[model samples]
Target chain A: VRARVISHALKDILAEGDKVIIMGHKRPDLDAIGAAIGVSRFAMMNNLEAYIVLNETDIDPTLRRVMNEIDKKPELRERFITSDDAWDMMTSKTTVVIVDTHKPELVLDENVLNKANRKVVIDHHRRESFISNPLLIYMEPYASSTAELVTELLEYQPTEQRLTRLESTVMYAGIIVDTRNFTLRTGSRTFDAASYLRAHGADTILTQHFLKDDVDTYINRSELIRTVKVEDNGIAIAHGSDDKIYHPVTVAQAADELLSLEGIEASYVVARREDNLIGISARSLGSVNVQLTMEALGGGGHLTNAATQLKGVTVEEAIAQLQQAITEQLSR
Target chain B: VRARVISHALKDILAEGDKVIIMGHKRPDLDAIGAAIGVSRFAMMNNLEAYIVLNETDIDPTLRRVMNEIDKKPELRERFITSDDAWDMMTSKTTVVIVDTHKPELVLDENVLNKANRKVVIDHHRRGESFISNPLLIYMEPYASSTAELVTELLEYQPTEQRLTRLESTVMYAGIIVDTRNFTLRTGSRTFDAASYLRAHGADTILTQHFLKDDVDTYINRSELIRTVKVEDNGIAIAHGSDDKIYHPVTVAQAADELLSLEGIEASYVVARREDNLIGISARSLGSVNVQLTMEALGGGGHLTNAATQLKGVTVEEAIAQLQQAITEQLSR
Candidate 1:
């Protein structure tokens, strides 16, 4: 019922004939890109002009493949503008739309909202006192992704126009990636959302391609998994050798996969991100507050997941630090 | 539409019998085990005697772990029997519910079907010439993700408060994951609906991850095979194992599935020496490529995306050469 009312109100906002700029968080993932496409297409359906501000050139490999499927249309392709171009669109008639992220510090262009006359916050993360005062706030903490929340809101639009195939598949893949292939944090409503997109021509096979991993990363993850040592309470800690410099993605993805191991409540991975720097990726199954754990290591994030980076640390030293921190945190 | 009809008929046959023996195909997979356990529990819920019969000691390791979880129920534990034991229970009034496979020959005791006047065939494989005759009910849907899915459809029709336990739901989820490769293949809207239903019933999907741990040897072997991977027509990934021999068939299939993860590969074939003189191939695809056609050309039979076959008196090198030519020829046309 609430979706019905706001989708009804979305028409009035677009009727004002102001420019809309849709943006996601920095280093955007599939959920961010999918929600941006969803809202931009919804705006286009209303005969309103909107642009998506993102770095289309350098993207995550899996999500970069997704952009190929979504950018097939000229209308959708042109809607993707750069950050500098986004700054040029901030006028009296401009409204900035933020999706997949609630914190102002995390937005792609930190200054876009300060200049806009109107703004909207559509996000799924638990809000932690964001800076923006938006005209509309759709915050659903229990929903899987901002893309899902956006899909729910799309139903409320006054127009009969549904999301096209490109938009539908993008959002569907968004949910799958966020929910970890529907195995984590999914419910009946999640399946209904997927069914909706599938009916609109969401390509499951194409979405599978969007989730592919390169051969090197896959082998590296397996090697890392072999070295896992877990706490009795089921928190896993795995590390790379001092001789290896690993991709940040390899570290992050391996950490995520470790959480799925039997008897594991959470996982923390300490690997080399640069020649002289250390990167740690942490994941959880809600048994422990990873954000609080990461916060002690110079990083802050939501309760279930977080990460941290450090300078001038060897892999062995980084492992020692991460292990001691987790040990101390667990004792508390 | 037939889910409700066959379920009622299955329930009716159980009601008229002294015992309901649920058996899956020989060399049971997660789906076969899950479906058999699902209906056996249903029989117990209705205050009827049910037995799940198989070569219980020889089950897959992952599925064996699931069976251990199911055996937590003492009633379910004591009732498990072997094929010979199943044949003994094939009284004139016995009702046998065969699941996951429909072929008459695949039955644990082929004589059991002939002895029992009442039989129900609940399977998801495409029907073949060996389809069981005179089954009181038959539920076969090639489109269904797994037999567990067909069983989930039974829950919706009952209006019965009977539901899957955490273990049961987890086992069923494992079957769906095995057949769909964790929902990466052979999925549909109904598959998701079944998964959703299972999740609501306390299926701890995360626990299923324990069953997916590959041993160090398996991973290293697959990586070594990957070093030999050569792409065919820019679509199919082909790999050859060591000349002597390789890991088990399931590990080869797992490696075959892993090969499809590389960029731009549609279908994959991983060949390994089974014995000194025998070679086997495991094939997997992502729906565009017809792996079934290629596998059939090599004298194998399976569904659209998955197929396998064995060659006798052939070296691993010869097997890979045959597979490369066959896959290349098929992909061209």
Candidate 2:
């Protein structure tokens, strides 16, 4: 249902001769990056020029490997634009397509979002008040992944050629990563999307490689999770002090790991830069709605799992305050 | 503590030149039978003619093996007499020593209890009505094993002779078997007595043989337990039936096993029968209400973990109905 709306919007953009720039949320996860690339691939198939802009150069290693295997030609790297380049390309004739993020504060570059003549929001997160003024907005909290929404869009659009194995594999990676291998927050729609992609030549063995992390990264994650503490109301709180990896995806993965402990019902990981700019990743097991917590903390995302960034607080202070807030909310 | 009392009573009987007839409750268990035999040995050492009579031939096989190793001369089998023979020996001049049984109805021969003029009751079960009247009497409920109580008596009565390895080993077997591998119903006194006995003669190989049972018996027991129906109150209610092999020890063991399955419960048990008689056997949760349901059914008696009797009912149906009535009297909300 959401795909037909995106396909109609794309047809209008093409008829009006509008140049499109596709982008994902900050600190891109596999679902965010995969959805961006998937929409760009759909636009290219229709003979329209599209570019996927990233907010940061630090893409998750798992998604990076998938991009490497599919787009074998090194020249394909040039197809990705930085936020600055995206801002430079925006004009009155430009149409900005935001994938996997609904909140403007979550955008890689809010300046690029403001510069575009028109905006389109395609996200799978629950609704929050921050999202506004999109020409076409498709938000489905029931969907498992943004990639699954992108697959629906592809199905509605007119096809010049079939989706490449690379497109299917990346989208499958997005579905698997977000759903935690179909063990959490999954419904029948998630499996149907997976089946549709599998029929389009998504190889499980090839996608498995994209899920692996380096040995050093695993060691760091293990050490951080070992010292994680759970509050009385089942909130798992931890802070990773090492600055060598400031990626939001890493923080979210660590939070997921911490929640797997025996008594933990919710988890949060805060990673900070030396300048005291902190990024918080929150996860819950359907008991506490984290999106409202993130919104109150000056950030917003999904309900069970979400993220927010704030300036002017150390990682320790942020964790302490978050723990206090969780306790207060659960007591209510 | 109980042994000291039993020894004083035995000395008084010996002073009068009367033969001592030692016996246990009907269908003797490890504690009842082992303590009976141990008390007989004490009597013989004190210059009295002592004989131990078994009510039934079907003693638990594991205990039989332990008793065999302890007394190779088969003195227990040779000295054993039927209930009638025990009755004949219970003259006004003869001294009747009842070991490990408090109730007279649980004795092998109630007639012998009636005829005997000089009676001595040395038991480890909880006190019920006054069944025996004599000068020397002892009943200790805090001890974990009955063998421990008997061993204490032997220690005081015959202190000079070292306890034979076989004697110590058989007593240790009785303690361990009654305590179910030391998992339930143990006291500080029980452990102290076992440690003293084991320190005298080690139990390296005897422990392994105490757990062995026939494969067919295991299968039959499991089958009966799996088909058992549990009715829920604050506690659980289990009901099952067994063939004629149901002795007092077997019935009590099965009742204890059924009670342990009820999580967060106070107590439970099953009422079954042997031949044409009904028996109500029960075990209890610690400090739970006294379980006199079996006594209410059998016109017989027992203690908390182990007790039983022969009933007037000729079928399992009448026995089960009588058991339900008895339980309803005490267990109803």
Q: Pick the candidate with the highest TM-score.
A: 1
For model 1 the local lDDT of residue A124 reads 82
Q: State the lDDT of candidate 1 residue by residue for A1-332, as single tens digits.
A: 66667776875775575788988988888899999988887787777888999875537677667667656653457778888888876686787889998888888878776777787888887765584667888777888888877776676664566677777878888998899887667876677677667767777777877777766667777667667787788788888887788888888888887765566678888888888888888888777888887888888786767999988889888777777787898885
Give per-residue CA lDDT, model 2, range A194-232, as digits (tens).
656765767664565576553334444554564466666
Report the error of model 1 at residue A119, Å.
Answer: 3.0
Q: Which stretches of candidate 1 lie over 4 Å from their true place?
A: A1-21, A40-63, A71-75, A78-96, A109-118, A129-131, A154-160, A219-239, A257-332, B1-19, B40-51, B73-94, B160-162, B227-253, B264-333
Q: DockQ of all candidates, in order? A: 0.42, 0.01
TM-score of 2: 0.38
Model 2 agreement with the true structure over B1-333: per-residue lDDT tens digits: 555665675676655747877777776766666566666666656666877776446456655665565455665456667777777766667877787777778886677777777777766667787666562445445444565445444544564453434554445445544554432233233343444344334433223223332233333343353245454555545555553545344645554553443333345555556445555444444335445554545575566644544565555556666666776776664
Clashing pairs in 1: none
Name the DockQ score for candidate 1: 0.42
Question: After TM-score superposition, what is the CA distance of residue A306 in candidate 1 from its true location, in Å?
Answer: 6.0
Off by over 4 Å in 2: A55-67, A70-78, A82-91, A128-133, A220-255, A258-284, A287-332, B1-333
